[PDB]
Design a protein around this ligand. Sequence first.
Ligand SMILES: NC(=O)c1ccc(NCc2ccccc2)nc1
Ligand SMILES: NC(=O)c1ccc(NCc2ccccc2)nc1
Lengths: 238, 238
Amino acid sequence: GSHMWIGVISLFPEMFKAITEFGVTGRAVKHNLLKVECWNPRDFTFDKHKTVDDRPYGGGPGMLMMVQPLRDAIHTAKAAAGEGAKVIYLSPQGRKLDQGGVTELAQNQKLILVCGRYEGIDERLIQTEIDEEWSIGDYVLTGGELPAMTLIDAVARFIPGVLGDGLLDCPHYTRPEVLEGLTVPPVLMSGHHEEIRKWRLKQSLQRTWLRRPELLEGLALTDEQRKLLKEAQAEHNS
Amino acid sequence: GSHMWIGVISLFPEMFKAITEFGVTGRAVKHNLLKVECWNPRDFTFDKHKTVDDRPYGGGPGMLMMVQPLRDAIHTAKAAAGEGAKVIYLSPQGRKLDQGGVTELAQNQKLILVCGRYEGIDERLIQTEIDEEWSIGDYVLTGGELPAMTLIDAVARFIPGVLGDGLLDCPHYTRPEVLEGLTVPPVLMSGHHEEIRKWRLKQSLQRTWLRRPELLEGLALTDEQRKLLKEAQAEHNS
Ligand SMILES: NC(=O)c1ccc(NCc2ccccc2)nc1
Ligand SMILES: NC(=O)c1ccc(NCc2ccccc2)nc1
């Protein structure tokens, strides 16, 4: 179906074996539904020790990505990608990634993900080589590899043939019928496909209201959703 | 220093090689600063085909984690962990993970991370086996492996000997002095350690104000921070 090519710039290309060789994403890669090609900036070095880090101007305790190997790696990825590729840099300063943001990034046929290590990359590289800056959350990691793999995994779920709403997911139950005294909701085993659908939607509205109330504020609930929410709030208030 | 043991329940334990064999986290594991031990629920199956998924009550297109292999795997991890271990389940319905949440989870000496596949796990398992439910962001992934690895990587940065603020990070510059016409801020190459510190803090306040304004609202800025923010806002308004 809709093929998706993702170019990756990273000092540890082996980390991406976690998604290219396992689970649903590994199957999407095997079936040529998703192509992940990695470029290591270490291969673009020229000194004897293959230096990929550099000291930052102004002092500072930390280090940065060395510009020349990183910049050359990026240009190589752009050449292989051709035109249309959107270059993305993963950093806490980037745009917060939500499901709506995942759908947007999934609209791209070609993507280039720059994985930064140490204290990040040079600011001038962002202005000249990076199109969009993204963040998977307000937390700091040792590298942009995991956020990159998170992005790739997220957008992969939208590729046609990979698999087979605004609210939190309803509770799910499977065998056995009774687990440590706790029983499965009888409505789920009633066969009433309409009552079951209404139940699941109702529980989704309740869990969203109790756990993530701010998510409901940015939603325009349907007449059915407004009903089930009012019922859930009434039942919660005994 | 402060040792940290993290037990992991996952159908793909090989994915965690991405953090246990590479970069800073891989070094922390090698130096016995961080221990990651994986249990595969597939090893706790008894049928010929090692079934680990089960059909959900009420119909539904998707599948769930089979309770018996998962439950047995969890109990085994608790036995090896001993007392004090906090069991965590990664799911979008969980508490949103921020840097403040990372610090909290880093206070635990022992952790058990349950990685859910398919449409998740049985709700009754969460009530009986899970202590805290967490989310790395408002997006859906093919599994809880990447969120688990994200958590492990995040809390690893707080382990003493692994390495060596509320605001977004300031711009960083390294060699060369001029890159495609763009120059390094002269203040950074002035040597003025006080002016440089004030500059970096000022840029952090400006980037936070322009990109993530909601982050500033939940902050009690110091007198110096209030000054530099007012100056940045004045300079931004020409
Ligand atoms: N929150 C995220 O998406 C994220 C991305 C990367 C990361 N570490 C890489 C990095 C470190 C410092 C500066 C720039 C990038 N941590 C978290
Ligand atoms: N947002 C997260 O932290 C997250 C965690 C897990 C995940 N996929 C695993 C899963 C799928 C369905 C139900 C429960 C867990 N996706 C995202």
